[PDB]
Amino acid sequence: RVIYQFPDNLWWNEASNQVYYAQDPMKPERLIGTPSIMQAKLLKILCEYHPSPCPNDQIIKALWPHGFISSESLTQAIKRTRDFLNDEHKTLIENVKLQGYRINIIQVIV
Amino acid sequence: VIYQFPDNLWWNEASNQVYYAQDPMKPERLIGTPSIMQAKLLKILCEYHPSPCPNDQIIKALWPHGFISSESLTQAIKRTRDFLNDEHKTLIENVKLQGYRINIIQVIV
Amino acid sequence: ILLRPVDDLELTVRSANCLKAEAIHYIGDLVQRTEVELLKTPNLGKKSLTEIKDVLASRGLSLGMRLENWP
Amino acid sequence: FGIDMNTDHTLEEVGKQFDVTRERIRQIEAKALRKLRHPSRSEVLRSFL
């Protein structure tokens, strides 16, 4: 069981894959829900590289290894992924130009 | 490679992050990721140390391909001073007719 | 006019900077290139290109002509 | 330089025109000088050598 903490008391439980709000990681309070398989993919690419930024080419290759996909698809994926993780202030995942995207992780429980 | 500056400022080149921390392995207050040419300038300042870097070489490194207006040099330095919150010019010192020098407390390899 | 160097056009330091970075030295080299080829130059944006167009059109010249056996 | 004027002036009273600053007057004059040196607006003056 691997669980990741995000700012504003957010948690994501990967093994069962639930995003939620909870003061206690073992006791959820408000369940945001289940991210999609490609959404979990997106958080995977942002998560395996912390604290280093994940380059745009690497995430694009990983998400769609066999698809002719434009970078606009990656960017709208980030946007409509914020649509689900409710990061209105762009603080959960930071976009730094010509260097890629990052996700702010407070702690990891394994 | 891990660089310490005055006032407990830690820069990690592998992850390329700068932050305030008493313990290098435990960030306390994150400043963040400098831009590309900021990284080039920091690496130049850390790579001629102890000696300072002449202006021609930093000019040729920050913008090699095209000769650039001179002010940009100083202006780039300003931002590299400002992002590292070096208001007192103690992290980047300028030696007249000698170049630009950086202050490193220690390096962790 | 085809035998003057680029600086005669009196370009903004941004422009002359960019065109000197791509080894575009002669107005023939300016004209034989097209708008899209210039817009692909790094740091050469749309408004820079439009002011190049205005200034070059001041001197009775335009972009995109084909000059045989240049130079 | 004193063109169309009785006396020549140094950087001080040239600054006294709008803003009393020396290095700005120098840099303005130098910019004007390299701008005039441009071969496009100097052929009429080169003929006086």
UniProtKB/TrEMBL annotation, chain A:
Residues 1-105 form the OmpR/PhoB-type domain. One of its GO terms (molecular function) is DNA binding. One of its GO terms (biological process) is regulation of DNA-templated transcription. Residues 1-105 bind DNA. The keyword Transmembrane helix applies. The keyword Amino-acid biosynthesis does not apply. Coiled coil: none annotated. Keywords: DNA-binding, Membrane, Transmembrane, Transmembrane helix. This is Toxin co-regulated pilus biosynthesis protein P. It comes from Vibrio cholerae serotype O1 (strain ATCC 39541 / Classical Ogawa 395 / O395). The chain holds residues 5 to 114 of 221 of the full protein.
From TrEMBL, chain D:
It is found in: Cytoplasm. Residues 1-38 are annotated as: Sigma-70 factor domain-4. Residues 10-36 form the RNA polymerase sigma-70 domain. It comes from the Bacteria. Residues 11-30 bind DNA. Coiled coil: none annotated. Transmembrane segments: none annotated. Interacts transiently with the RNA polymerase catalytic core. Belongs to the sigma-70 factor family. RpoD/SigA subfamily. Sigma factors are initiation factors that promote the attachment of RNA polymerase to specific initiation sites and are then released. This sigma factor is the primary sigma factor during exponential growth. This is RNA polymerase sigma factor RpoD. It comes from Vibrio cholerae serotype O1 (strain ATCC 39541 / Classical Ogawa 395 / O395). The gene is rpoD. The chain holds residues 571 to 619 of 621 of the full protein.
